[PDB]
């Protein structure tokens with residue numbers, strides 16, 4: 015065997031070796047003494063140039079002009095520009111390539127079979143919070159496409175020396191309010207308590223429902239963030255019903271169609287895009303298992319079990335598992351009926367297996383975070399449970415970044 | 420740096436300082452994480468410090484850390500190693516080390532029970548025949564007519580000179596898997612290779628789906644010997660469903676006693692190549708993995724059809740629904756048979772309590788998240804939401820090469 019990690023699939027009995035991991039330039043949180051792979055948050059001058067050069071080489075490889083005159087001219091360009099200004103700027107096609115590659119590189123995304131199919135909106139001309147809003151609105155209109163969802167990213171101006179960042183304060187473009195009660199409970203999404211109160215502090219008149227869509231708090235360089243309300247016609251939502259349990263519709267549950275992450279930093283060739291929201295479509299377990307059944311999210315498991323007349327007084331009745339299955343089915347059924355793209359965890363994980371094969375041949379490996387890739391219900395019923403995975407950081411990358419406040 | 424470890428459901432944070440006590444490297448590096456891999460990627464002074472550190476662990480455990488008994492025991496160990504290149508454990512040290520190895524086992528969600536472990540000293544064992552007698556005693560004791568009791572039997576340690584004592588079977592109870600001349604399997608596909616080894620060392624096979632394998636037991640540098648387990652010693656549970664009448668008709672069953680018999684127990688640098696241990700099942704091992712793994716009994720489709728589910732399409736969640744009913748049937752059937760089993764909610768709730776116990780007791784607990792989180796309903800259990808640190812402490816249970 016080679017001195018690259020051996021990766022086994024225990025269902026099929028097949029073996030690969032990950033050589034791509036050698037391309038990692040960035041350390042994760044593990045050491046030989048202890049593994050820290052389960053942590054959610056594993057917390058320039060010449061440094062910039064080498065990252066730039068590496069990225070420029072990656073671009074030229076992908077267009078098969080590596081070593082070419084154009085490749086060598088671009089490198090000189092980059093270093094000349096960095097030499098006189100301290101930074102440099104990407105060509106358009108380099109940005110598109112870098113954005114797809116960041117997605118391709120994202121170890122926590124099971125959706126990566128789709129990585130080559132990404133609409134990249136270039137918004138590097140944006141000069142105000144108002145224009146960020148127009149751009150985001152367009153993104154949302156394009157991406158939503160009346161239920162026939164399309165993966166997209168909008169990229170706003172890069173971080174600059176001593177000038178303020180573009181930031182979207184919201185963690186997603188669509189978030190339901192979380193209202194802290196006098197009794198200490200939360201109405202709405204407890205995930206969004208903090209962003210909800212920031213919105214109120216910045217002048218938003220709050221509602222009082224379980225599903226109030228929040229305004230966007232948008233920040234242009236060195237300015238207070240500005241508040242913007244999404245026209246409700248832009249925000250496609252799906253009311254939830256169950257295919258045979260008629261009373262499920264009476265619960266008044268719903269979810270929005272477009273999962274759009276807005277708090278991550280896109281890093282390309284050492285350049286930092288602090289606002290670069292991206293969207294795809296949901297895997298149904300995200301809604302039906304996590305968002306709805308997490309004890310610290312909507313926490314509806316008991317309510318549903320009571321309605322199904324399950325024995326919630328003992329763990330061994332498996333009342334949680336039964337209720338969770340029906341909530342997931344309701345989500346799938348309801349998105350289907352509504353004609354809103356969604357993928358269940360079996361279809362998603364099967365397609366991620368194909369992705370791993372594609373990447374083994376294309377690049378000799380695929381960075382993957384097992385804990386995230388394996389769905390939160392029915393784990394070993396999906397092929398990825400049985401697949402060993404190697405996790406490592408490649409660039410271009412999406413990274414977590416601190417909250418702006 | 421000592422890792423900060425967060426629980427995301429409750430927002431609580433701890434610090435793991437137990438990991439500093441690790442002496443053995445796992446497979447990860449700063450460049451890449453290998454925590455999802457099933458198998459680990461890969462002189463007298465070295466034995467002496469392992470031995471001394473384990474002796475220190477032992478006298479600390481009984482509060483006699485610094486006593487005459489302690490100092491004199493270190494001299495004994497040192498004298499023995501320097502003269503002979505090895506040493507031996509007192510029975511009480513063996514009992515302390517076996518519990519500690521369980522306690523330290525990162526893949527075990529049942530560690531709340533770690534202090535309750537019956538240790539059989541089988542170190543005065545000199546033949547395969549004698550191993551069989553000890554194993555029969557273990558099974559009878561651990562089984563206890565359905566009221567299962569955790570146990571370990573410890574056979575003689577490895578010695579520089581000779582071959583190891585080994586039990587060839589991966590468990591004391593295993594169902595045969597018979598390969599057909601078209602590659603396909605009848606019985607348990609996990610056991611194809613052990614089944615052939617049995618037939619080949621002379622066993623007369625059955626042709627059923629749940630034929631209990633005999634044991635291949637090996638004394639040092641001898642051919643292994645075959646021993647049929649007496650039927651009455653192997654308690655099995657027929658599987659039925661509380662509401663689905665047809666479920667029984669599937670003819671499914673599972674055995675009561677989970678006893679791992681291929682792992683090595685390392686205490687104080689000494690190695691016990693045969694030290695089978697048993698507890699009781701968590702229902703998902705049977706209901707989810709053993710029965711629904713595509714490379715195991717793979718029954719999901721059969722049950723789905725019987726439930727008249729829409730099998731034409733994944734998005735009806737037919738797999739999820741059949742798996743739930745199968746786990747329910749295991750739980751129901753074990754309860755009906757009065758055989759100890761724990762469901763995955765109750766087990767993971769106990770493990771959270773264990774974490775807290777261990778944080779106070781030791782300042783950490785090594786845990787392999789991928790193993791601890793159950794194979795159905797992961798995020799429905801608290802352990803999903805709990806960050807974990809994985810690392811190797813000694814005493815340990817380890818994997819070892821297969822004897823053939």
Ligand code: HEM
Nearest residue numbers: 117120122123124125128165166292293294295296297412
């Ligand atoms: C095409 C439809 C897509 C599906 C079904 C999909 C699926 C998923 C799922 C299930 C997660 C885990 C989310 C969670 O547990 O909260 C995830 C995370 C991730 N996805 Fe994908 N994805 C898709 C498109 C995309 C696109 C277009 C990008 C970027 C261009 C992307 C990059 C990521 C990143 C960076 C994470 C980690 C987010 C974090 O750590 O907060 N995904 N995706």
Ligand code: HEM
Nearest residue numbers: 521524526527528529532569570696697698699700701816
């Ligand atoms: C008290 C009842 C017990 C319960 C409910 C329990 C639970 C579990 C579960 C669910 C697993 C993972 C099994 C799998 O996925 O196949 C496991 C693995 C393990 N358990 Fe426990 N356990 C118990 C007793 C014990 C005892 C008595 C020991 C040792 C004395 C032990 C040491 C281990 C070890 C070493 C592994 C890893 C096995 C391997 O890697 O193949 N367990 N146990």
Ligand SMILES: Cc1ccnc(CCCCCO[C@H]2CNC[C@H]2Cc2cc(C)cc(N)n2)c1
Nearest residue numbers: 273274275277278292293294295296297300414
């Ligand atoms: C593109 C796409 C497709 C499908 N689903 C999505 C939604 C992804 C939401 C991920 C949010 O993750 C949050 C909530 N749970 C762990 C935590 C991890 C995290 C932490 C931080 C500081 C930022 C961030 N983006 N993600 C996005």
Ligand SMILES: Cc1ccnc(CCCCCO[C@H]2CNC[C@H]2Cc2cc(C)cc(N)n2)c1
Nearest residue numbers: 457677678679681682696697698699700701818
């Ligand atoms: C004490 C107890 C309590 C509850 N369950 C059990 C049974 C545990 C059986 C674990 C067997 O694991 C096998 C089959 N699947 C992954 C694989 C890991 C492994 C590999 C090797 C070479 C040896 C070994 N013991 N374990 C034992």
Ligand SMILES: C[C@H](O)[C@H](O)[C@H]1CNC2=NC(N)=NC(=O)C2=N1
Nearest residue numbers: 052053054385386803804805806
């Ligand atoms: C502690 C643990 O890492 C967290 O609960 C992780 C586990 N796996 C996960 N997987 C995915 N896809 N999303 C998560 O939010 C998530 N949470």
Ligand SMILES: C[C@H](O)[C@H](O)[C@H]1CNC2=NC(N)=NC(=O)C2=N1
Nearest residue numbers: 399400401402455456457789790
């Ligand atoms: C590849 C991955 O590590 C294996 O499939 C793991 C995942 N988690 C697991 N968890 C448990 N408890 N037993 C397993 O056999 C198991 N298999």
Ligand SMILES: [Zn+2]
Nearest residue numbers: 044049447452
């Ligand atoms: Zn790791």
